[PDB]
Design a protein around this ligand. Sequence first.
Ligand SMILES: NCC[C@H](O)C(=O)N[C@@H]1C[C@H](N)[C@@H](O[C@H]2O[C@H](CN)[C@@H](O)[C@H](O)[C@H]2N)[C@H](O[C@@H]2O[C@H](CO)[C@H](O)[C@H]2O)[C@H]1O
Ligand SMILES: Nc1ncnc2c1ncn2[C@@H]1O[C@H](COP(=O)(O)OP(=O)(O)NP(=O)(O)O)[C@@H](O)[C@H]1O
Ligand SMILES: [Mg+2]
Ligand SMILES: [Mg+2]
Length: 263
Amino acid sequence: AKMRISPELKKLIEKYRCVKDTEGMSPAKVYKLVGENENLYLKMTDSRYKGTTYDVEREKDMMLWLEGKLPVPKVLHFERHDGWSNLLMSEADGVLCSEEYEDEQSPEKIIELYAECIRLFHSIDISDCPYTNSLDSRLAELDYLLNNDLADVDCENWEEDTPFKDPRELYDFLKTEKPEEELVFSHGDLGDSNIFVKDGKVSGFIDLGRSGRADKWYDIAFCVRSIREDIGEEQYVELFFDLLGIKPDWEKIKYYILLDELF
Ligand SMILES: NCC[C@H](O)C(=O)N[C@@H]1C[C@H](N)[C@@H](O[C@H]2O[C@H](CN)[C@@H](O)[C@H](O)[C@H]2N)[C@H](O[C@@H]2O[C@H](CO)[C@H](O)[C@H]2O)[C@H]1O
Ligand SMILES: Nc1ncnc2c1ncn2[C@@H]1O[C@H](COP(=O)(O)OP(=O)(O)NP(=O)(O)O)[C@@H](O)[C@H]1O
Ligand SMILES: [Mg+2]
Ligand SMILES: [Mg+2]
């Protein structure tokens, strides 16, 4: 009752015209705040998601920690208000990657960008990284989500051709076939709509609730998935690995792609 945002947060944003973001299918609410001289974004998750990699508070922590390490929005305000975790942030710098480069026209550039994300991430010191997204941690949260009907279990997972017939069957695979983990900085949802570019370089990362320490193959796997889905031609997957300077590990790649299935 009353409000989802505090009186002080409301005071902060009242001069702005709120526009609800439509493209975005997580449990968070995202609002673009249009002001006279700049836009802000306000992102909110409810208490059901506290402690999970959807938790906007966890995203806020990573956003703060990443300042000076990766280009990310500025955290302007955070609060917990009546169950809700609310994050007010600045607008990322540059153009959303999915908007700047289309798959039909700039395949090599897209591959190049993804590759540069991986390289950049590997240079980040994770000594004092706030969160460790080990598989034990991710699996524990997936178990929590499934138990409480909070996972993304619907739609494509009902199709008769699905590799696993129900969520617990997938969960079992993930739980019992964990690969070896060598921890590095991981974005957690590396994709063309969580990344900004400017002057042909990466200029911002957003959607950071799932970022933290994780195995190096995790983000690489997301790149492979994107390349195959958006571009399709396998040549470009091979090119991606040519830029990385490593041979693929299809077992680990398949694993992390399956891990993200229910998120
Ligand atoms: N042949 C592949 C099918 C397989 O079921 C699978 O990989 N399925 C995956 C499941 C994955 N969780 C989806 O993620 C997407 O949904 C999440 C929320 N439920 C978002 O938080 C996330 O950022 C977004 N990437 C992904 O969607 C892909 O990302 C695109 C959107 O950004 C597009 O929607 C789709 O390509 C989809 O292909
Ligand atoms: N700080 C920002 N600067 C500029 N654009 C933003 C910013 N935050 C969010 N957006 C836009 O809003 C969209 C969704 O924000 P995002 O943080 O990715 O949502 P989400 O709740 O995590 N949903 P999903 O991307 O499906 O997981 C982005 O793709 C951008 O288009
Ligand atoms: Mg996103
Ligand atoms: Mg997200």
